Ligand binder design. Structure first.
Ligand SMILES: O[C@@H]1[C@@H](O)[C@H](O[C@@H]2CO[C@H](F)[C@H](O)[C@H]2O)OC[C@H]1O
Ligand SMILES: O[C@@H]1[C@@H](O)[C@H](O[C@@H]2CO[C@H](F)[C@H](O)[C@H]2O)OC[C@H]1O
Ligand code: CL
Ligand code: CL
Ligand code: ZN
Ligand code: ZN
Ligand code: ZN
Ligand code: ZN
Ligand code: ZN
Ligand code: ZN
Length: 374
């Protein structure tokens, strides 16, 4: 409701306690935020699950072969343990924020360039060996502290084919199989292994993901759940399509986690307002009604969803701002209409507002829409 006041989130009813029998409530964080008093208070008050926005990605953990940097990841793990939070590991394998040394052959040349079939096969086995050592080292360190693992991220293309990353060009589908088998072998039966992706609701990617995981499980590849990034909009994807997607994977015996939820104010490609102040009130009411519907649906499906994680804490910090392109007409006025004329765009200079907490750490209408029982 819009009657409900814009109070400090540190005085508001706890979000994780509202949902504690339905699913955990998580947030993606940076270590610097554990030094910010407000962010610490926000995490202590409202969240019971945590994930690293960046410092557990492949390039952050092993930027050079043999050089492991766990310092930053350790800080997130320590904070979680001290506050009784679940931890998700994001992420063991990804085609982005991944060090290039992985994909160089013995002479330092890119493996993708290799044409000889015998050398190509040698490169596959070398890559798969490096992959296993990366996973082994990380999981040997964290298997007792981190329950949920994004083993692979974004391995299915939006075209419904496997994404043709260097991982896939060099090693084929086996890099996916090796990643899960290695995590299971070094982590044991008690860690939960996930395949994570965006637009899991969208054909042809959805059923390609479905076929992939169904085939892998049939071959004995250990995979326990699907991570739905859920980088969504006020109107897309539809709740019915979210519901159908989540039932589809639950029918395979898979857990579902909402791993990166944000509800952007904009379309795609976004035409953003240049500042938070410029976003009209009505956008916040539209977002709150979207959030109201969305969490009612998560509650409906709470037996198939173990965790809902936001990709951030409060509106003062969201990766969505890097997509918030501001369009200007010939008179220098801002253009937010997705079809209107415009002369220039300022990429990533605008402001999105995706969470239930505003940038001054006060509750948004979206918060009241999901803290109630209506
Ligand atoms: O790099 C990925 C990025 O491409 C993805 O953005 C989606 C692209 O497809 C549609 F346009 C959606 O609206 C976008 O959200 O977000 C995840 C990121 O890893
Ligand atoms: O800070 C940014 C970070 O938030 C972003 O994280 C990705 C967001 O899209 C999906 F959720 C991916 O799985 C996340 O890893 O990555 C880019 C970084 O600059
Ligand atoms: Cl209950
Ligand atoms: Cl960011
Ligand atoms: Zn309940
Ligand atoms: Zn709590
Ligand atoms: Zn301002
Ligand atoms: Zn549940
Ligand atoms: Zn960030
Ligand atoms: Zn509600």
């Amino acid at each position: 409701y819009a009657k409900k006041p814009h109070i400090s989130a540190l005085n508001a009813p706890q979000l994780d306690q509202r949902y504690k029998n339905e699913f955990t409530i998580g947030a993606a964080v940076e270590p610097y935020q554990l030094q910010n008093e407000k962010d610490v208070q926000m995490l202590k008050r409202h969240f019971n699950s945590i994930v690293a926005e960046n410092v557990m990605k492949p390039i952050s953990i092993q930027p050079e072969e043999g050089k492991f940097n766990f310092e930053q990841a350790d800080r997130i793990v320590k904070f979680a343990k001290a506050n009784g939070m679940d931890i998700r590991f994001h992420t063991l394998v990804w085609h982005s924020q991944v060090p290039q040394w992985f994909f160089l052959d013995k002479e330092g040349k890119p493996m993708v360039n290799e044409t000889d079939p015998v050398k190509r096969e040698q490169n596959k086995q070398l890559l798969l060996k490096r992959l296993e050592t990366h996973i082994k080292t990380i999981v040997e360190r964290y298997k007792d502290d981190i329950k949920y693992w994004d083993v692979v991220n974004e391995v299915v293309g939006d075209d419904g084919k496997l994404r043709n990353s260097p991982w896939y060009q060099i090693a084929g589908i086996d890099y996916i199989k090796v990643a899960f088998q290695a995590a299971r072998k070094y982590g044991g039966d008690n860690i939960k292994l996930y395949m994570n992706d965006y637009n899991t609701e969208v054909e042809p990617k959805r059923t390609a993901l479905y076929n992939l995981v169904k085939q892998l499980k049939e071959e004995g590849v250990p995979i326990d759940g699907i991570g739905h990034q859920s980088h969504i909009q006020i109107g897309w994807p539809s709740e019915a399509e979210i519901e159908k997607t989540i039932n589809m994977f639950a029918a395979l015996g898979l857990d579902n986690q909402i791993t990166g939820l944000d509800v952007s104010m904009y379309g795609w490609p976004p035409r953003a307002y240049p500042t938070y102040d410029a976003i009209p009130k009505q956008k916040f009411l539209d977002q709150a009604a979207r959030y109201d519907r969305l969490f009612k649906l998560y509650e409906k499906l709470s037996d198939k969803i173990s965790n809902v994680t936001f990709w951030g804490i409060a509106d003062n910090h969201t990766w969505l701002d890097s997509r918030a392109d501001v369009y200007y007409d010939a008179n220098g006025n801002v253009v937010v209409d997705p079809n209107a004329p415009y002369a220039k765009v300022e990429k990533g200079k605008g402001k999105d507002a995706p969470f239930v907490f505003g940038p001054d750490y006060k509750v948004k209408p979206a918060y009241w829409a999901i803290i109630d029982h209506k």
